[PDB]
Symmetry: C4
Subunit: 218 residues, 4 copies
């Protein structure tokens, strides 16, 4: 009964792929994609963009329960990300790729979703994130403490709905420096900040080719 | 805590009948009918037609949760079929009988439902099936990759609802070569392909007497 | 982790009262009242009438989930009765008392609720009951094979709703010989068969003072 | 798998903070705040007021499922309080503070919520409380036996809704002597008994600065 992808790795499973994990407060467990290569391996993936094949402009229930496929574009679901990040102290790794085959990454030494929320869904799965390092620059620390906002559930610090306006779903403030669940607009676009944006690397008008968000215990 | 009917058999239960199984991600478990005779035994039944006593023209929730009785005509439910087929690599056995006491079978070396779906219900319990052998001919490989479609939830490649039109529930494309959840029309019928059809054996206008779909780990 | 009140007794708990039980397919478990005196003890109570303090003219959800208190008048809930009676072969004991301090009982060697139902709620928690003995006479064997009917969910063999007409909830045919979830009308009443009726003992116009329905493995 | 904060303490965790507990009939478990200092420690917190940062004028579902954060103002949820208080015999400790830095406490040797309810939600999570001692005086024993009432679900002994009228959620009679889930009105207020009231200490027109309700096995 591994609790995450690091337990899977330490048990002797060295190959990238889909494995069963059993978080402390999710004993039924569920399947995840494990990255067993990045910085020694043991990363549990919870988000991937790579080809714009999956619609990410989804409502609250979809972002709670998850959508897409573990072998392609997917969102694991905030209920699962909560179950994972509350059972130990996790770091976040974000891998990015542009349409010119360029790559960069952001590492956060602390990452959590609704860590102290009695009802994390009610409380809007608030983001805990700290301690940046990497090549992509920081585009997430400004989002620390913000609730998750979708097109049909607004908990941001804007007078309008940030998720509706920037066609995504994120821990929006007023509104964002990152938007990895945005529209797959494929590189440079005329529209403002409504693509797969990581502003610190490629600004507010470049939708990235590939994103992967994953967690490992520190 | 057997995970399926093969575990039940290997534990020393050799009789056909109803047993408790406990899939990896369904730890509460549920009761299934075990076929302990076919090709050495250890088959978990998830579909049976035999007398048209049970209505199979049911909606999404019915095909998710299951209906009928384990000792007669039933559908185990896609949530249970998902839980079973994701915990190991399963083969599918389909037993068929006509109203002239003729029998045939289809064996598939690979069978799965929503194998990599984050939310298999959202994703429409897509069919994985490959490697045919048997006497009935192949009527399922064309359905590989298709989502499950009911009269009240359309995910097929038709401009209309295949489930509504052919009075069934299946991994419809545009529309089908098999329709084992179709109406129990009892043998030859004037209506087109809306019966218990296995086209490769008995064509598109013969509703079979008996069908049984069951799985065993390879 | 006792599965029922017999496990509780055999573990060395000899006192009547409330205990935790953990049925095979209900691993979370729940509290029940255990009768540790009747015919050696080990009986799991699922119904009690004694003072008409609790309303038994309730809808489908109430009879699924249960109502009242374990220490007084209650219905354990059909989901729990299903979980109990499907994990082994149970007998039913029915204790009755009139308002003249007279007592009688009915014993059934076989009792079950939705024993082979894929979805027992969908299938209406059909009654399995056989092999009568006792002093009260038989008022249940005619109900064998019937689905459970409430005022807001009709699955009986009447043109009207038996539960609505006889102000109860039961495995109604057309309509009943027993009605222990009927109105607490307190002894003889002018109204026809809408009280706590056990017809074989006290006929169709006498609402009993006390009823208790309980199960033990054979 | 500690069942409560006393198990956490006895396992060798001596620090105040958030821990995972696994009640008998809530095996998935959940996180709670443990008080490891008060009278030897081992107290499971289920309510805290301290700064009026969280809205406590919430409906039935919120008081069932819980709200706020474990590290600040929160309500653990009646489903969790039921799961905790039914697995053993618990005492209640209530810590109070006024806006003049004055403190007092109420100890109850017996505390429970829906202890014998078949469906504690249906039954309205009725209060069991007895055996007062402390400095704050008794403001809860009059509430013993009363169901929990919210603005959108009335089970009190008033002709109006006590929760609506006194802007809280409590085991209201007609109506209250305590109201710790009332509005955070900050000390003396003109409005009648609609603040964080503990009448025996600070009367019906003083909203307390701090409240903490917590349980430990006797
Ligand atoms: C970017 O990486 C991908 C995957 O490794 C390569 O396919 C790209 O190479 C380009 O496309 C291939 C099919 C071939 O025509 C090659 O000559 C091209 O350079 C690679 N580079 C770019 C610029 O996309
Ligand atoms: C088909 O198989 C069934 C079950 O084994 C048999 O009952 C059928 O036999 C037929 O019906 C029986 C009752 C008897 O009258 C016999 O003489 C018949 O041949 C069997 N054959 C057919 C053609 O249905
Ligand atoms: C029926 O049983 C009950 C419980 O044991 C008894 O209370 C009844 O006794 C009657 O009521 C008591 C209070 C006392 O007045 C006695 O003299 C009565 O006979 C008992 N009998 C009847 C007829 O109810
Ligand atoms: C009440 O307790 C708090 C926390 O210990 C103290 O801060 C209060 O002290 C008062 O405020 C501080 C900042 C300082 O100005 C001190 O001189 C004040 O007395 C303490 N007392 C009161 C009356 O609030
Ligand atoms: C997209 C977004 O939030 N952009 C910032 C810079 C702003 O509008 O103030
Ligand atoms: C039933 C069905 O789909 N029949 C195929 C042959 C078709 O209509 O093209
Ligand atoms: C109450 C009930 O069903 N009575 C039977 C005898 C009948 O009406 O036929
Ligand atoms: C608030 C409350 O219930 N007060 C009591 C004294 C009453 O009104 O009778
Ligand atoms: Ca807003
Ligand atoms: Ca269609
Ligand atoms: Ca009817
Ligand atoms: Ca009222």
């Amino acid at each position: 009964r591994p609790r995450d992808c690091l337990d899977v790795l330490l048990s002797g499973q060295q190959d990238d792929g889909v494995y069963s994990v059993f978080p402390t407060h999710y004993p039924a467990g569920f399947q995840v994609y494990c990255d067993m290569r990045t910085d020694g391996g043991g990363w549990t993936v919870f988000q991937r963009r790579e080809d714009g094949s999956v619609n990410f402009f989804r409502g609250w229930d979809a972002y709670r329960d998850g959508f897409g496929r573990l072998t392609g574009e997917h969102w694991l679901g905030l209920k699962r990300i909560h179950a994972l990040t509350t059972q130990a102290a996790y770091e976040l790794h974000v891998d990015l790729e542009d349409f010119e085959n360029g790559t960069a990454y952001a590492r956060y030494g602390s990452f959590g979703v609704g860590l102290f929320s009695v009802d994390p869904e009610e409380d809007g799965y608030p983001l805990t994130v700290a301690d940046y390092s990497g090549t992509a620059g920081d585009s997430l620390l400004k989002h620390s403490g913000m609730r998750f906002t979708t097109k049909d559930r607004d908990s941001d610090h804007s007078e309008n709905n940030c998720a509706a306006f920037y066609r995504g779903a994120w821990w929006y403030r007023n509104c964002h420096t990152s938007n990895l669940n945005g529209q797959y607009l494929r590189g440079a676009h005329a529209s403002y900040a409504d693509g797969v944006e990581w502003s610190s690397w490629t600004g507010w008008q470049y939708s990235l080719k590939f994103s992967e968000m994953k967690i490992r215990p520190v």
